[PDB]
């Protein structure tokens, strides 16, 4: 921000940051040496406001907005000083509008194989528009050491900081200028939240796919489907990535198909995201 010496000042009620849809009052007070202003004007990003403006003091004026819904607006007020045909800038002010944070829910922490990271994400919820922060707390059920991590999206906690036992508590706190919520605590066991290394499809009746996982017990799911059909066909596996995983599929001739696969540590809670779409137009 470049500094502009103001010949006055501006102030907003309820405040410069307010809930969307609130009625707001903007006040502007002239303080210009040798100048009892004839009039005072308000501009929103250079557009003159011509209504709901009220002369109060001989020096103060008020602009009033109803159900103010814009997330951002820069405001300028100027004075018509006598002895001049031009307007002296009094001051400007930035106002902004949003909502207070919803309670973060759907908190989930997982560890992708070979990452060294625990990835905690959550549903922040309703868009807040304004600047909100997130503090992820981590508590060891063994030692009760608490760590806090600041983020504006999600968080990767390095596994080297999770060596105080395996049972942990994680909650996510959200805060902006309009409110501050906190999530229900999630208890995790580091061994229960692991997702096997990604699985990938490579070559197209026979489909070649493989993963670098080293998890002892891995279960998988491959689903196929004619591009134009809408019901998936899931073929459940219990695979073993010793050698490459090839999967044979019957299918009609000159038709285009789609395949995806996903795997998990047999029995664990989470899976991994489905693969990207592997297309295949077979011959006639």
């Amino acid at each position, epitope marked *: *921000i*470049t*500094n502009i010496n103001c010949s006055g000042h501006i102030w907003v009620e309820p405040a410069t940051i307010f809930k969307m849809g609130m009625n707001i009052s903007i006040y502007c007070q002239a303080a210009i040496k040798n100048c009892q202003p004839r009039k005072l004007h308000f501009y929103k990003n*250079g557009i003159k406001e011509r209504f709901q403006i009220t002369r109060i003091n001989k020096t103060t004026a008020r602009l009033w907005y109803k159900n103010f819904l814009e997330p951002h607006a*820069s405001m*300028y007020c100027t004075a018509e*000083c006598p002895k*001049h045909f031009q307007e002296t*800038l009094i001051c400007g002010k930035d106002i902004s509008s949003g909502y207070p944070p919803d309670i973060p829910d759907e908190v989930t922490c997982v560890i992708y194989e070979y990452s060294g990271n625990m990835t905690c994400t959550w549903n922040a919820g309703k868009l807040t528009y304004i600047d909100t922060k997130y503090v992820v707390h981590v508590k060891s059920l063994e030692t009760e050491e608490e760590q806090q991590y600041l983020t504006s999206s999600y968080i990767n906690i390095s596994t080297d900081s999770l060596q105080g036992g395996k049972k942990y508590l994680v909650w996510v706190q959200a805060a902006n200028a309009l409110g501050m919520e906190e999530s229900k605590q999630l208890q995790i066991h580091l061994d229960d939240i692991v997702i096997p290394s990604a699985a990938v499809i490579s070559r197209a009746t026979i489909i070649y796919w493989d993963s670098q996982t080293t998890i002892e017990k891995v279960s998988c799911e491959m689903r196929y489907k004619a591009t134009t059909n809408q019901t998936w066909n899931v073929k459940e596996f219990d695979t073993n990535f010793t050698y490459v995983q090839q999967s044979e599929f019957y299918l009609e001739p000159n038709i285009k198909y789609v395949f995806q696969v996903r795997c998990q540590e047999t029995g664990k809670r989470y899976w991994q995201p489905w693969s990207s779409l592997f297309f295949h137009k077979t011959p006639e």
Partner: nanobody, 120 residues
Framework: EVQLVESGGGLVQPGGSLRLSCAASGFTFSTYAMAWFRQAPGKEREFVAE???????YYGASVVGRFTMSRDDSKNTVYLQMNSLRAEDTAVYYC??????????????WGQGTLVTVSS
């Protein structure tokens, strides 16, 4: 890139006049606010004028009445007519472009500046 290049700087007498130019390019001119600033030796950068496509134009208290800003959106240029020049106006004059959704006092672009000396 974008570019703001000023012109019209030079020497002038106390009481004289002159006019600065500023050619603008790269960004959408109509939607940006254009501003003149100045910076005397040692003294700090100060506001002198600003003008919008809508026509809204306001001035710093120090130069209102004596100075007059205008802008040709076709020619993508702003001007600053400086009259009744006093020695106080001896300073380098800067052209500035302000984006609307930015702050009310954050200018993303600045010209190199033209020096204006008011002798005596």
């Amino acid at each position: 890139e974008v570019q703001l290049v000023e012109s019209g700087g030079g020497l002038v007498q106390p009481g004289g006049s002159l006019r600065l130019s500023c050619a603008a390019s790269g960004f959408t001119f109509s939607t940006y606010a254009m501003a003149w600033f100045r910076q005397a030796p040692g003294k700090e950068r100060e506001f002198v004028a600003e003008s919008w496509s809508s026509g809204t134009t306001y001035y710093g208290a120090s130069v209102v009445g004596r100075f007059t800003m205008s802008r040709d959106d076709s020619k993508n240029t702003v001007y600053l007519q400086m009259n009744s020049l006093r020695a106080e106006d001896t300073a380098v004059y800067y052209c500035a472009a302000k984006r609307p959704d930015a702050g009310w006092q954050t200018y993303d672009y600045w010209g190199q500046g033209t020096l204006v000396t008011v002798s005596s």
